[PDB]
Design a protein around this ligand. Structure first.
Ligand SMILES: *C(=O)CSCCNC(=O)CCNC(=O)[C@H](O)C(C)(C)COP(=O)(O)OP(=O)(O)OC[C@H]1O[C@@H](n2cnc3c(N)ncnc32)[C@H](O)[C@@H]1OP(=O)(O)O
Ligand SMILES: CC(=O)SCCNC(=O)CCNC(=O)[C@H](O)C(C)(C)COP(=O)(O)OP(=O)(O)OC[C@H]1O[C@@H](n2cnc3c(N)ncnc32)[C@H](O)[C@@H]1OP(=O)(O)O
Ligand SMILES: Nc1nc2c(ncn2[C@@H]2O[C@H](COP(=O)(O)OP(=O)(O)O)[C@@H](OP(=O)(O)OP(=O)(O)O)[C@H]2O)c(=O)[nH]1
Lengths: 774, 155, 187, 6
């Protein structure tokens, strides 16, 4: 009665009005399970989230169908989808006639990957609402994911038959997408079967005038003909796709196979020249030839014919357009283009031909920057700037050269010069913020970055940057705070040595290291939180893409969701953060400036109390934290061919799981090794771990597999490594060095061997190893 | 369109104008001079583009003996983009504002020693009024110099 | 060189990343999901290519994007909206935006029968204005005072869409032999 | 550029 009044007001968004009533109920029946659960959801909707969880837990400790439904909504709200499924089921089991639960179930089940049960939910909902097309598509999809391709197709075809001439204009798009999806399912089943592929082709032709995804239709068609062996009748299709988008390199490369001229370059150059006439402004016609030709007089006509009219019009990316040719064919191309533009430059007057002059200088600066001729690079770009000081692009290229030379502060300053010319442009601002972070200048970076952020309730844009998921800024800042951490640690161990006002200083240095170690880890932990949201963001789409009618696209979402914790920025943050977590495990085995907190605040006051990240760095279980916050999710999704075996090796070494360490090492040797210095590095570290004093069986596997690779029965390992794996394997050395405690090998003679191996590296790379890894 | 066009200055591209002004006319202009244009005198600003590149600009003032009308305070073009009508377009804009403001006079103070520039103004229908004004320009480095005043009547 | 293709879910993290680098107007990942899973034929991207944060594959990385949707607020005939457009600064002034925009304009009509398209653009943004007003021929529908967060006004722009006008073959030449499709490329 | 402010 009175509880039912309060349930309406939840759907009616009158959350306080609802609570007013529920308090009256619980005043005279504080043990009323129904009221308690609904109170939690009302209090969450506000949301006083700490009271909400307490009211819910109290209700749960006391064990209705409507109560189960309310719990289920709350659990989904708190991302407890597994518990949401328990309570949504309990509503049905305890006599609910609301058939909308089956749709909410299918959503949750799909969300947690349980498609077996999703198929059941899809079916029962479809049986309760055959009227709506979304529920058919929904069902067909669930069958598809459970391998029932033929059952899926049948479901789609049944709706098609029921609505042969019943599709309105507002339904035409959804219809179009469901046709191609049915074609998709058929296509899979056909594999390479000629008869079936002919039927798939048949099907594609009937739907064409009702399918609006022409590009999609045509791409499918071309792949069919190729599978049928009708290569010529596929070439006609690839030529239609090129005419619809003559800037797609992929369509050109496929046509080479379609006409079977892929082999000889004589036939290829004849084609692209003919294409050049049709699409003169497009890239592939003129670029593709360059990849294969060796006939000097023939290609140098074209390279010149390609790169000059770009420099004529003054396109910035000209060099970037040919950087592959450089990268792939350094020997053949780089001493040839050099001359072919340097002599063009020689015929250019700066007053009469300004645009071509300055951009021809821009190319040559990048040219000699690539060849590691740093004075030559600076020379030409200086010439460009002095000529026309109003192009931000010239300051960008210049600042790259100085970063390559290790002059981080100078480089950042050059961008800062360019930034002031154009305060409307965020790209230059970003690149400036990036370079200042690289020179460990965080205050300046934050200041500059804050010029483009909504700072309505913060002193700077840190919060706003977390709100828009700006991983670019957050990963970089994390890494800077890490460098500032290590640098101020060394200055603490140098202050420890000088004991013969220093006590004032070390007290300040001891705050700085805690502050910078904490904020580094704080910032690295913002990334996984983003990607966990990305996973949660799929929730709505389990039902939304069914109504809108985008099943092909929804299936792609699922694959995308299954790869989230393997994407470059998640992996970058993980690996970098491991350095901190690992060392915190190693180390334990062997306020007034709370005013300052305001400027480092990343999350709202309500949610976050630990702003400097003190709890994070002073945890008692660093290895469990790394697993929960980063490693676990990456491990369950990552593919074998992209798996970082060095990381999982180093991970298992600190949780007492050596058997795995062997597996990591073993698998690494199968792809890369077994002559890699890293393979050596890891092996030697694992062997020492087996026996005898070490606090931890694996020896068996060592002698089983790699007896002829190492002198196992056991000496000079550092020498032996220089014999077996070569001295100049820089990375294997570094690996050993960080295990100098648990594996002594003349750590000093290792250190210098590394220092002697640095000579061939670029300035910045030498300095950073010298400063941050040793 | 013409390869050279004009467009407005805003607070975002004010640094463009200062860089143009600092290379073409070193030492004359204070840092705060450009600030006061958008920190908020009735001013008129404009930039000159060649192939969408900032290669010149104008800063002109409205002033209510005479010494009246539109004062040119900056008119600069990068070296290599000179002799392409660009400085003339910037001048014509300043003249056009003079007419739009219902003013009948445009004037400018040049360094008395700078002759190449003096003739370029006179070539555009300017004429000297009076003679060398004693120590009128003050440089950022402290230095000083006599200046000359050119005047052109706009009907 | 720069490649031009359709957008998929696998580009949106890099699309977001380009947006964050190139514009003051930024959206959360869910908004990009909402786009690419609603109009999976409308958006296009520009990447680098290597033959035999923005990194999608080895060698291939996103330098531009055009984020596109249909209007789903009613009740008018079907129309489109250009949500966002960026091209990393180092790859600007090459015709990337034109190619993205032209494809998206043709998509909006061909796929969704959009009879027109709207967008918002800052007054002071010269490059963006040239593209829409000059290169693409958009009419200024209105001025929108204090549209952006920093307080800057916006032009509300619009373009009517007709299928044959928008075909990509029409703009092949800056200033005229075609491919008829019927044989042969051996003549 | 669409603005998502409110
Ligand atoms: C909301 O999203 C709608 S408003 C989009 C504003 N975006 C934005 O400001 C992001 C930063 N800028 C860019 O990403 C980029 O500069 C664009 C997208 C504005 C333009 O990209 P492109 O570099 O690809 O432009 P093109 O297609 O190469 O050029 C098309 C025409 O525009 C002229 N152009 C280019 N840069 C210019 C500058 N800086 N100033 C004036 N005009 C510029 C080109 O000359 C070209 O004109 P044509 O006459 O040659 O066709
Ligand atoms: C204190 C203050 O208010 S600021 C004083 C501002 N100036 C300075 O301090 C110096 C900085 N700027 C300069 O020196 C520039 O050269 C300016 C602004 C004087 C002129 O810029 P330009 O771009 O050369 O102007 P523009 O191209 O219109 O002038 C070219 C001259 O040749 C003519 N001309 C036009 N096109 C051409 C051409 N292609 N070739 C040769 N002459 C040409 C013009 O009529 C003009 O007349 P003149 O030669 O008889 O004097
Ligand atoms: N296309 C391509 N690019 C490659 C390849 N190998 C390395 N690069 C790098 O690409 C970088 C260009 O910068 P971006 O990668 O766009 O930087 P961003 O992610 O921060 O935007 C250069 O490094 P950088 O100088 O560190 O960049 P920055 O610091 O100047 O941004 C260059 O060395 C390759 O095979 N192909």
């Amino acid at each position: 009665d009175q509880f039912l009044e309060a349930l309406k007001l939840y759907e009616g968004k009158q959350y306080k009005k609802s609570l007013k009533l529920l308090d009256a109920i619980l005043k005279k029946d504080g043990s009323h399970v129904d009221s308690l659960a609904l109170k939690g959801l009302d209090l969450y909707s506000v949301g006083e989230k700490d009271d909400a969880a307490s009211y819910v837990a109290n209700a749960i400790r006391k064990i209705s169908p409507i109560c189960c439904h309310v719990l289920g909504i709350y659990m989904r709200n708190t991302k407890e989808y597994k518990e949401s499924i328990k309570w949504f089921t309990a509503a049905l089991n305890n006599g609910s006639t609301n058939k909308q639960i089956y749709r909410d179930l299918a959503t949750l089940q799909s969300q947690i990957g349980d498609f077996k049960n999703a198929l059941v939910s899809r079916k029962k909902y479809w049986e309760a609402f055959l009227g709506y097309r979304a529920n058919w598509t929904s069902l067909a999809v669930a069958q598809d994911v459970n391998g029932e391709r033929q059952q899926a197709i049948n479901t789609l075809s049944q709706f098609e038959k029921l609505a042969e001439g019943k599709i309105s204009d507002s339904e035409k798009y959804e219809h179009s997408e469901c046709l191609m999806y049915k074609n998709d399912i058929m296509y899979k089943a056909a594999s390479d079967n000629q008869d079936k592929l002919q039927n798939v082709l048949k099907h594609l032709n009937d739907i064409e005038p009702c399918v609006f995804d022409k590009f999609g239709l045509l791409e499918r068609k071309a792949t069919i003909y190729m599978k049928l062996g009708q290569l010529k009748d596929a070439s006609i299709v690839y030529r239609t796709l090129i005419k619809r988008n003559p800037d797609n390199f992929k369509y050109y490369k496929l046509l080479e196979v379609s006409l079977g001229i892929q082999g000889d370059n004589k036939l290829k150059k004849a084609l692209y020249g003919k294409l050049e006439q049709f699409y003169p402004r497009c890239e592939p016609p003129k670029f593709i030839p360059l990849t294969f030709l060796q006939d000097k007089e023939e290609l140098s006509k074209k390279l010149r014919e390609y790169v000059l009219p770009q420099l004529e019009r003054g396109v910035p990316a000209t060099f970037s357009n040919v950087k592959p040719l450089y990268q792939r064919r350094k020997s053949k191309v780089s001493p040839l283009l050099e001359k072919i533009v340097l002599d063009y430059l020689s015929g250019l007057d700066p007053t009469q031909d300004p645009i071509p002059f300055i951009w021809t200088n821009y190319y040559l600066s990048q040219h000699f920057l690539f060849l590691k001729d740093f004075p030559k690079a600076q020379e030409y770009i200086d010439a460009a700037l002095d000529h026309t000081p109003t192009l931000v692009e010239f300051y960008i290229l210049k600042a790259r050269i100085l970063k390559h030379l290790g002059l981080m502060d100078t480089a950042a300053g050059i961008l800062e010069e360019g930034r002031q010319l154009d305060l409307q442009d965020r790209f230059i601002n970003c690149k400036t913020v990036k370079y200042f972070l690289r020179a460990n200048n965080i205050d300046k970076a934050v200041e500059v970055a804050s010029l483009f952020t909504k700072n309505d309730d913060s002193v700077n844009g840190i919060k706003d940057l977390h709100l828009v998921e700006a991983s670019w800024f957050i990963v970089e800042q994390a890494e800077a705070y890490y460098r500032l951490y290590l640098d101020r640690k060394k200055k603490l161990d140098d202050l420890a040595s000088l004991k013969k006002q220093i006590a004032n200083d070390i007290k300040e240095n001891q705050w700085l290291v805690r502050k910078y170690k904490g904020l580094a880890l704080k910032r690295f932990n913002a990334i996984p939180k983003f990607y966990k949201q990305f996973e949660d963001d799929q929730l709505d789409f389990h039902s939304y893409c069914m109504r809108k009618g985008t099943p092909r696209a929804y299936l792609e979402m699922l694959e995308w969701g299954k790869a989230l914790y393997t994407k470059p920025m998640y992996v970058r943050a993980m690996k970098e953060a491991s350095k901190l977590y690992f060392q915190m495990h190693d180390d334990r085995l062997k306020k007034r400036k709370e005013t300052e907190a305001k400027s480092v605040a990343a999350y709202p006051s309500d949610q976050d109390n630990d702003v400097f990240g003190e709890k994070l760095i002073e945890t008692s279980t660093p290895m469990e934290d790394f697993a929960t916050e980063f490693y676990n999710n990456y491990s369950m999704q990552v593919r074998e061919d992209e798996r970082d075996y060095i990381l999982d090796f180093e991970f298992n070494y600190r949780i007492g799981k050596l058997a795995l360490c062997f597996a990591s090492l073993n698998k690494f040797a199968k792809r890369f090794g077994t002559t890699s210095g890293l393979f050596g590095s890891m092996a030697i570290v694992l062997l020492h771990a087996t026996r005898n004093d070490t606090p931890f069986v694996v020896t068996k596997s060592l002698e089983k597999e790699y007896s002829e690779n190492f002198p196992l029965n056991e000496f000079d390992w550092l020498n032996f490594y220089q014999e077996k794996f070569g001295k100049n394997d820089i990375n294997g050395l570094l690996f050993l060095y960080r295990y100098r405690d648990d594996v002594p090998i003349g750590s000093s003679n290792l250190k210098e061997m590394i220092i002697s191996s640095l000579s061939p590296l670029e300035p910045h790379s030498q300095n950073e190893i010298l400063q941050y890894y040793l | 369109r013409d390869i050279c066009t004009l467009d407005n200055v805003y607070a975002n591209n004010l640094g463009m104008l200062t860089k143009l002004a600092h290379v073409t006319v070193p030492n004359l202009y204070q840092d705060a001079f450009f600030s006061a244009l958008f920190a908020e005198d009735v001013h008129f600003t404009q930039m000159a583009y060649y192939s969408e590149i900032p290669v010149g600009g104008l800063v002109a003032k409205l002033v209510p003996l005479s010494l009246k009308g539109i004062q040119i305070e900056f008119l600069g073009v990068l070296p290599n983009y000179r002799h392409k009508s660009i400085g003339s377009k910037l001048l014509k804009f300043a003249e056009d504002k003079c007419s739009e403001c219902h003013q009948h006079n445009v004037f400018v103070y040049l360094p008395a020693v700078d002759d190449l520039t003096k003739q370029w103004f006179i070539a555009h229908g300017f004429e000297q009024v009076g003679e060398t004004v004693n120590n009128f320009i003050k440089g950022v480095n402290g230095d000083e110099q006599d200046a000359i005043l050119l005047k052109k009547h706009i009907s | 060189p720069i490649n031009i293709r359709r957008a998929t879910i696998n580009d949106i993290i890099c699309m977001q990343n380009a947006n964050l680098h190139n514009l003051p107007e930024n959206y959360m990942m869910k908004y990009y999901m909402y786009h690419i899973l609603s109009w999976p034929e409308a958006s296009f991207v520009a990447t680098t290519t290597t033959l035999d944060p923005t990194y999608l594959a080895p060698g291939e990385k996103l330098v531009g994007y055009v984020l596109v949707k249909m209007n789903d607020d009613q009740n008018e005939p079907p129309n489109g909206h250009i949500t966002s457009l960026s091209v990393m600064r180092t790859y600007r002034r090459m015709g990337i935006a034109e190619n993205l925009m032209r494809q998206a304009l043709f998509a909006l009509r061909e796929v969704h029968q959009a009879e027109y398209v709207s967008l918002h653009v800052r007054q002071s943004n010269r490059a963006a204005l040239h593209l829409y007003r000059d290169t693409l021929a958009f009419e200024v529908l209105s001025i929108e005072k204090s549209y952006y967060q920093d307080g800057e006004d916006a032009y509300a722009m619009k373009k009517v869409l007709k299928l044959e006008e928008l075909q990509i073959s029409n703009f092949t030449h800056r200033r005229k032999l075609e491919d008829d499709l019927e044989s042969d490329l051996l003549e | 550029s669409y603005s998502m402010e409110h």
